């Protein structure tokens, strides 16, 4: 019943690690996209105000 | 606080310097390890004549300077140009005065005795730091992953290493060095991507092949039936938009680049690859310590960040190791700074104070003192 | 060694599930932020071109 | 209770120490008889500099220390290192303070008069025990099997002995010592197993050959037509799984190792073997006592534990002894601790109190007192 319990444990630990890893990568890709989005929104509002004033 | 705040950690690499204060979670300063020397006389608007350039100003202005790398394969090769990178680190990057900060530095795996004495000579005699300490890089990486025995596969910009460590002592005779790393890897992608029918013609095309390698490259497990997959042409492909519109597509080569780390034969290298080398390090160590090393393969370095590197290595050494063995490949997320973080921890530690080499030790014992 | 292997298996399966759940939530928050970022970038480029033309 | 609880029994061996409280059924403490001295300066994490290591910490850390064995062939050869093993036994292993516990110690068969006086000098003058007593090892083994006359074949890690005992007095002129024991026996298996086409290369391979010897080795009766049996290749073979998967098979050699105890010629020894030596001891004794010794061959010691040792010895001496004689080979199950158990019994006994050498006897008579 053991080689079975240990094998299931190892496969679920492997799965666990793969998912935990896929996550540091998606949550990190994030701080990056959310920061890029805010940076662009602020560049947008600035140029929207400058177009009003040149118009 | 005197030095709790005050300890500096400088990790000198072949491609990047990582620097900051012991205590922080990540390097305050990261920048290329170059020193540019202007090919012509002249000035930028508003500045004076500059004899030299370091880090990013050397990279940005590379067209008018002759660029030089002080650290070849992890070892300091030019000491005039290294003292220049240190100067830049303290005074411009961290903006600290060095003469009131203890400095933890790092060196490479089988760093020649004479070098560890020379950077001590320059730290104490030209920068006048209060105290300093040189840690071995794999050893800080291991320790930053909590443990004290394990084997580190360390891979950055100019070198790859395997450093088996037992209760803190890195094992000299079992360490392996493979001179193929992220630098070699960007240049190989370059060719398989021009070979895909492309042109990285201007310098704004060159530089970004490296950003393609970092963002889109993969280490597939079963690299065999991944090429096979490439052919049926699934939605495996991946297009990147260049500085301009010029949408370049990379489907397949995406993983042909990190398969170079397992097959050096992709690049005319006759040396063995990462996984075999992990293993050979291990069958060069004492017998009784080999179960420990196998359950503690810690990975560190920019080039070990390719996703699925750990799964491929997992299966690469399970299938070479005796089945009675437990394999375990630890690859943390912050691994591009493991080395640095291990230094930050150690140097901010409560017990490390008694290993700092002080100017008292030095002025009295000569460079020999820190050399150990 | 068993009650130990099974207990470690159960705790790692629990951990695995918690992380897999935290992820559907962060990858989903994402398609949303990345889509918002692209929508704003296109509003930005449009107004940047119109300010150029009024200037 | 004062000392009913309080009597200690320490059996000092060439390979193992066995220790505990008189009264118990088995030793509370069993550990190697080594004293490790670090080859280099340094520390384990969290500990201080250690000058010395004893028992299992010396074995576990053997790669950085020079290991030394205080007892060569049952006799104490280094008294600085023995006082170290005793210190460890009292203070760390049994965690008792010695100055309030009577201590029964053991010595070897023809232990030099001067040694029995020296360990008494160290027991009373550096450990300050209330009282002590030195029993001869074969004599405690016999007694633990109930009787008082018999001949003990005693075999441990560095020595084998035959000690004919009559109404308690071990017979000096009939005692035989054969310097080939379990230590010699593990190293011979080692070679017949590498010779089977193997490699005990790392220290985790070395150590376990000894665990193969203990678990799988046999003493076959009719070792002649057991080799013959090996050849027809029956299901006589036996595979052991190593620290990892590496399933090693041992069919035959399994018994070629204890056949060394009857044939010393297997190992370049010219001495006679166990059974002949049992016998020779016996035809060196008085005539009238030889029927007694023959019906009371008591076996003790780790190396006499090989199954079928008793049957081979049974038939080995029947066929050398006059047919008018009764042969009887007693081999109890607890025999790896006979010596110790005999001491536990004796020292917890109601009548032994009047043989304890007290500090009163010593401070008044000199080491001579206990020497007898």
Short mmCIF file of C-alpha atoms in Angstrom, two decimals, chain D residues 27-344:
data_model
loop_
_atom_site.label_atom_id
_atom_site.label_comp_id
_atom_site.label_asym_id
_atom_site.label_seq_id
_atom_site.Cartn_x
_atom_site.Cartn_y
_atom_site.Cartn_z
CA UNK D 27 22.61 -2.37 27.69
CA UNK D 28 21.17 1.10 27.84
CA UNK D 29 24.09 2.29 25.74
CA UNK D 30 25.91 0.69 22.84
CA UNK D 31 28.27 2.72 20.66
CA UNK D 32 31.64 2.59 18.83
CA UNK D 33 34.82 2.58 20.72
CA UNK D 34 36.41 5.45 18.79
CA UNK D 35 37.77 8.90 19.65
CA UNK D 36 37.99 11.26 16.74
CA UNK D 37 40.35 14.15 16.60
CA UNK D 38 39.60 16.86 13.90
CA UNK D 39 42.09 17.08 11.09
CA UNK D 40 41.20 20.85 10.50
CA UNK D 41 40.14 23.96 12.31
CA UNK D 42 36.49 24.92 11.99
CA UNK D 43 32.99 24.36 13.41
CA UNK D 44 29.53 22.86 12.82
CA UNK D 45 26.76 25.44 12.61
CA UNK D 46 25.73 26.47 16.09
CA UNK D 47 28.38 24.54 17.92
CA UNK D 48 31.72 25.59 19.30
CA UNK D 49 35.15 24.24 18.48
CA UNK D 50 35.38 20.70 19.65
CA UNK D 51 38.64 19.14 20.49
CA UNK D 52 37.42 15.61 20.30
CA UNK D 53 34.58 13.39 19.29
CA UNK D 54 33.53 9.95 20.69
CA UNK D 55 31.30 7.08 19.60
CA UNK D 56 28.80 7.78 16.90
CA UNK D 57 29.63 11.47 16.45
CA UNK D 58 33.17 10.33 15.63
CA UNK D 59 31.88 7.77 13.18
CA UNK D 60 29.43 10.16 11.51
CA UNK D 61 31.91 12.91 11.12
CA UNK D 62 34.84 10.59 10.17
CA UNK D 63 35.85 12.46 7.04
CA UNK D 64 37.26 15.48 9.03
CA UNK D 65 38.78 13.65 12.05
CA UNK D 66 41.54 11.09 12.70
CA UNK D 67 39.80 8.16 14.26
CA UNK D 68 41.49 6.10 16.96
CA UNK D 69 40.66 2.83 18.62
CA UNK D 70 41.73 2.78 22.43
CA UNK D 71 41.34 -0.95 22.79
CA UNK D 72 43.48 -3.08 20.56
CA UNK D 73 42.47 -6.73 20.69
CA UNK D 74 40.56 -6.36 23.94
CA UNK D 75 43.49 -4.72 25.84
CA UNK D 76 43.45 -0.88 26.59
CA UNK D 77 46.31 0.51 24.55
CA UNK D 78 45.70 4.26 24.98
CA UNK D 79 44.71 5.47 28.42
CA UNK D 80 44.14 9.17 27.41
CA UNK D 81 41.62 8.10 24.81
CA UNK D 82 40.01 5.47 27.08
CA UNK D 83 39.32 8.01 29.88
CA UNK D 84 37.65 9.97 27.08
CA UNK D 85 35.31 7.00 26.20
CA UNK D 86 34.48 6.47 29.90
CA UNK D 87 33.74 10.15 30.36
CA UNK D 88 31.38 10.03 27.41
CA UNK D 89 29.70 6.92 28.82
CA UNK D 90 28.91 8.31 32.20
CA UNK D 91 28.14 11.86 31.38
CA UNK D 92 26.53 11.82 28.00
CA UNK D 93 25.32 8.31 27.31
CA UNK D 94 23.99 7.30 30.75
CA UNK D 95 23.87 10.97 31.93
CA UNK D 96 24.69 9.95 35.48
CA UNK D 97 27.20 11.57 37.82
CA UNK D 98 29.77 8.74 38.51
CA UNK D 99 30.64 9.85 42.08
CA UNK D 100 27.52 8.31 43.49
CA UNK D 101 27.37 5.06 41.43
CA UNK D 102 29.23 1.74 42.04
CA UNK D 103 30.77 0.74 38.63
CA UNK D 104 31.32 -2.92 37.46
CA UNK D 105 33.78 -2.98 34.65
CA UNK D 106 35.08 -5.80 32.50
CA UNK D 107 38.54 -6.79 31.38
CA UNK D 108 39.95 -9.33 28.95
CA UNK D 109 41.21 -12.85 29.58
CA UNK D 110 44.95 -12.43 30.35
CA UNK D 111 44.72 -8.67 31.00
CA UNK D 112 48.05 -7.51 32.39
CA UNK D 113 48.02 -7.00 36.19
CA UNK D 114 49.19 -3.47 35.71
CA UNK D 115 46.18 -2.47 33.56
CA UNK D 116 43.62 -3.76 36.12
CA UNK D 117 45.51 -1.57 38.62
CA UNK D 118 45.56 1.39 36.13
CA UNK D 119 41.82 1.47 35.34
CA UNK D 120 41.25 1.26 39.07
CA UNK D 121 43.59 4.23 39.55
CA UNK D 122 41.50 6.14 36.92
CA UNK D 123 38.12 4.97 38.19
CA UNK D 124 38.76 5.98 41.79
CA UNK D 125 41.20 8.86 41.31
CA UNK D 126 39.83 10.76 38.25
CA UNK D 127 36.09 9.71 38.27
CA UNK D 128 35.73 9.34 42.04
CA UNK D 129 33.26 6.44 41.86
CA UNK D 130 32.14 5.11 45.38
CA UNK D 131 33.18 1.55 44.57
CA UNK D 132 34.08 -0.56 41.56
CA UNK D 133 34.93 -4.15 40.49
CA UNK D 134 36.56 -5.63 37.37
CA UNK D 135 35.02 -8.99 36.11
CA UNK D 136 36.73 -11.15 33.38
CA UNK D 137 34.59 -11.22 30.29
CA UNK D 138 34.23 -14.99 29.56
CA UNK D 139 33.48 -15.47 33.20
CA UNK D 140 30.42 -13.12 33.00
CA UNK D 141 29.27 -14.77 29.84
CA UNK D 142 29.27 -18.22 31.48
CA UNK D 143 27.54 -17.09 34.54
CA UNK D 144 24.83 -15.32 32.56
CA UNK D 145 24.05 -18.81 31.09
CA UNK D 146 23.44 -19.98 34.64
CA UNK D 147 26.62 -22.08 35.11
CA UNK D 148 30.05 -21.99 36.76
CA UNK D 149 32.10 -24.54 34.90
CA UNK D 150 32.25 -24.59 31.18
CA UNK D 151 34.49 -23.24 28.42
CA UNK D 152 33.49 -19.98 26.68
CA UNK D 153 34.33 -19.36 23.03
CA UNK D 154 34.22 -15.59 23.10
CA UNK D 155 34.39 -13.63 19.80
CA UNK D 156 33.73 -10.01 19.15
CA UNK D 157 35.23 -7.32 17.09
CA UNK D 158 39.04 -7.52 17.47
CA UNK D 159 39.66 -10.87 19.49
CA UNK D 160 38.54 -14.48 19.84
CA UNK D 161 39.22 -16.42 23.03
CA UNK D 162 38.60 -19.73 24.69
CA UNK D 163 38.42 -19.40 28.45
CA UNK D 164 37.97 -22.68 30.35
CA UNK D 165 36.37 -21.82 33.76
CA UNK D 166 36.10 -24.21 36.74
CA UNK D 167 33.84 -23.30 39.67
CA UNK D 168 34.37 -19.75 38.69
CA UNK D 169 38.13 -19.55 38.33
CA UNK D 170 39.19 -18.96 34.72
CA UNK D 171 42.11 -21.26 33.97
CA UNK D 172 45.10 -19.09 32.91
CA UNK D 173 47.21 -21.76 31.28
CA UNK D 174 44.42 -23.15 29.10
CA UNK D 175 43.09 -19.84 27.62
CA UNK D 176 43.69 -19.35 23.84
CA UNK D 177 43.51 -16.17 21.91
CA UNK D 178 42.98 -15.98 18.18
CA UNK D 179 43.30 -12.44 16.73
CA UNK D 180 40.67 -12.84 13.93
CA UNK D 181 37.17 -11.61 14.60
CA UNK D 182 34.16 -9.67 13.14
CA UNK D 183 36.35 -6.74 11.96
CA UNK D 184 38.62 -9.12 9.96
CA UNK D 185 35.44 -10.85 8.76
CA UNK D 186 33.77 -7.72 7.33
CA UNK D 187 36.94 -6.93 5.37
CA UNK D 188 37.13 -10.39 3.90
CA UNK D 189 33.46 -10.27 2.81
CA UNK D 190 34.29 -6.93 1.25
CA UNK D 191 36.88 -8.48 -1.01
CA UNK D 192 34.79 -11.63 -1.91
CA UNK D 193 31.95 -9.28 -2.78
CA UNK D 194 34.06 -6.87 -4.92
CA UNK D 195 35.52 -10.08 -6.34
CA UNK D 196 31.86 -11.09 -7.19
CA UNK D 197 32.19 -8.09 -9.58
CA UNK D 198 31.27 -5.08 -7.38
CA UNK D 199 32.34 -1.76 -5.98
CA UNK D 200 32.14 -0.38 -2.54
CA UNK D 201 33.43 2.85 -3.56
CA UNK D 202 31.95 5.69 -1.42
CA UNK D 203 31.83 5.48 2.40
CA UNK D 204 28.08 4.72 2.17
CA UNK D 205 29.05 1.58 0.27
CA UNK D 206 31.87 0.58 2.70
CA UNK D 207 29.76 0.70 5.92
CA UNK D 208 26.86 -1.37 4.66
CA UNK D 209 29.07 -4.44 3.73
CA UNK D 210 29.11 -4.88 7.49
CA UNK D 211 25.25 -4.79 7.56
CA UNK D 212 25.25 -7.39 4.77
CA UNK D 213 27.58 -9.64 6.90
CA UNK D 214 25.27 -9.29 9.93
CA UNK D 215 21.88 -9.80 8.10
CA UNK D 216 22.61 -12.32 5.34
CA UNK D 217 25.68 -14.31 6.54
CA UNK D 218 25.50 -17.94 7.50
CA UNK D 219 27.67 -20.72 8.89
CA UNK D 220 26.81 -23.73 7.03
CA UNK D 221 27.28 -27.19 8.29
CA UNK D 222 28.88 -29.20 5.54
CA UNK D 223 30.39 -26.17 3.93
CA UNK D 224 31.76 -28.75 1.46
CA UNK D 225 28.53 -29.72 -0.23
CA UNK D 226 27.23 -26.18 0.16
CA UNK D 227 29.66 -24.82 -2.42
CA UNK D 228 28.56 -27.88 -4.50
CA UNK D 229 24.96 -26.77 -3.88
CA UNK D 230 25.89 -23.19 -4.91
CA UNK D 231 26.89 -24.49 -8.36
CA UNK D 232 23.64 -26.40 -9.19
CA UNK D 233 22.19 -22.96 -8.25
CA UNK D 234 19.31 -23.37 -6.12
CA UNK D 235 17.26 -20.59 -4.64
CA UNK D 236 20.19 -20.22 -2.13
CA UNK D 237 21.03 -16.68 -3.51
CA UNK D 238 20.16 -13.47 -1.63
CA UNK D 239 19.80 -9.93 -2.90
CA UNK D 240 20.06 -6.94 -0.60
CA UNK D 241 18.89 -3.41 -1.69
CA UNK D 242 21.63 -0.81 -1.09
CA UNK D 243 21.10 2.86 0.43
CA UNK D 244 19.56 3.50 -3.02
CA UNK D 245 17.98 0.98 -5.55
CA UNK D 246 21.23 -0.81 -6.55
CA UNK D 247 20.17 -4.32 -5.71
CA UNK D 248 23.23 -6.30 -4.99
CA UNK D 249 23.09 -10.13 -5.04
CA UNK D 250 24.97 -12.45 -2.71
CA UNK D 251 24.30 -16.06 -3.16
CA UNK D 252 27.22 -18.10 -2.27
CA UNK D 253 29.82 -15.79 -0.36
CA UNK D 254 27.14 -15.44 2.21
CA UNK D 255 28.75 -18.49 4.01
CA UNK D 256 32.29 -18.24 2.57
CA UNK D 257 32.74 -15.40 5.09
CA UNK D 258 32.05 -17.39 8.41
CA UNK D 259 33.89 -20.51 6.88
CA UNK D 260 36.85 -18.08 7.58
CA UNK D 261 36.38 -18.73 11.33
CA UNK D 262 37.05 -22.54 10.77
CA UNK D 263 39.61 -21.99 8.00
CA UNK D 264 41.91 -18.98 8.81
CA UNK D 265 43.74 -20.03 5.57
CA UNK D 266 41.01 -18.11 3.64
CA UNK D 267 42.71 -15.01 4.90
CA UNK D 268 46.39 -15.85 4.94
CA UNK D 269 46.23 -16.84 8.56
CA UNK D 270 48.36 -19.84 9.56
CA UNK D 271 46.74 -20.19 13.03
CA UNK D 272 44.33 -22.99 13.85
CA UNK D 273 40.54 -22.36 13.77
CA UNK D 274 37.76 -21.88 16.36
CA UNK D 275 36.82 -25.60 16.76
CA UNK D 276 40.33 -26.95 16.95
CA UNK D 277 41.16 -24.22 19.36
CA UNK D 278 38.10 -25.12 21.56
CA UNK D 279 39.52 -28.57 21.61
CA UNK D 280 43.13 -27.69 22.22
CA UNK D 281 42.14 -25.55 25.21
CA UNK D 282 40.39 -28.63 26.45
CA UNK D 283 43.30 -31.09 26.02
CA UNK D 284 45.42 -28.46 27.98
CA UNK D 285 43.18 -28.74 31.06
CA UNK D 286 43.03 -31.32 33.83
CA UNK D 287 41.70 -34.71 32.72
CA UNK D 288 39.01 -35.09 35.31
CA UNK D 289 37.51 -31.67 34.26
CA UNK D 290 37.43 -32.38 30.54
CA UNK D 291 33.92 -34.07 30.59
CA UNK D 292 32.55 -30.84 32.15
CA UNK D 293 34.06 -28.45 29.67
CA UNK D 294 32.79 -30.63 26.80
CA UNK D 295 29.20 -30.55 27.87
CA UNK D 296 29.41 -26.77 28.41
CA UNK D 297 30.73 -24.89 25.44
CA UNK D 298 29.08 -21.55 25.96
CA UNK D 299 29.26 -19.12 23.13
CA UNK D 300 29.27 -15.37 23.44
CA UNK D 301 30.10 -12.37 21.28
CA UNK D 302 28.80 -10.53 18.20
CA UNK D 303 30.74 -12.71 15.77
CA UNK D 304 29.28 -16.00 17.19
CA UNK D 305 25.80 -14.89 16.10
CA UNK D 306 26.10 -16.18 12.45
CA UNK D 307 23.21 -18.79 12.26
CA UNK D 308 24.32 -22.47 12.23
CA UNK D 309 27.50 -21.68 14.09
CA UNK D 310 26.48 -23.89 16.93
CA UNK D 311 25.58 -26.92 14.65
CA UNK D 312 28.92 -26.67 12.81
CA UNK D 313 30.74 -26.42 16.20
CA UNK D 314 28.66 -29.29 17.56
CA UNK D 315 29.81 -31.55 14.83
CA UNK D 316 33.22 -30.05 14.68
CA UNK D 317 34.15 -31.05 18.20
CA UNK D 318 32.09 -34.34 18.41
CA UNK D 319 34.30 -35.61 15.67
CA UNK D 320 37.52 -34.62 17.52
CA UNK D 321 36.45 -35.62 21.01
CA UNK D 322 36.65 -39.28 22.33
CA UNK D 323 33.17 -40.94 21.60
CA UNK D 324 32.67 -41.71 25.28
CA UNK D 325 32.10 -37.95 25.63
CA UNK D 326 29.09 -35.77 25.69
CA UNK D 327 29.47 -32.63 23.57
CA UNK D 328 27.16 -29.62 24.24
CA UNK D 329 27.34 -26.25 22.49
CA UNK D 330 25.21 -23.64 24.26
CA UNK D 331 24.60 -20.52 22.14
CA UNK D 332 21.88 -18.27 23.68
CA UNK D 333 19.96 -15.64 21.61
CA UNK D 334 21.04 -12.63 23.59
CA UNK D 335 24.75 -13.70 23.15
CA UNK D 336 25.93 -10.38 21.64
CA UNK D 337 25.33 -9.05 25.26
CA UNK D 338 26.13 -12.23 27.42
CA UNK D 339 29.08 -10.56 29.01
CA UNK D 340 27.02 -7.50 29.91
CA UNK D 341 24.02 -9.41 31.15
CA UNK D 342 26.26 -11.60 33.35
CA UNK D 343 27.56 -8.37 34.89
CA UNK D 344 24.04 -6.96 35.37
#
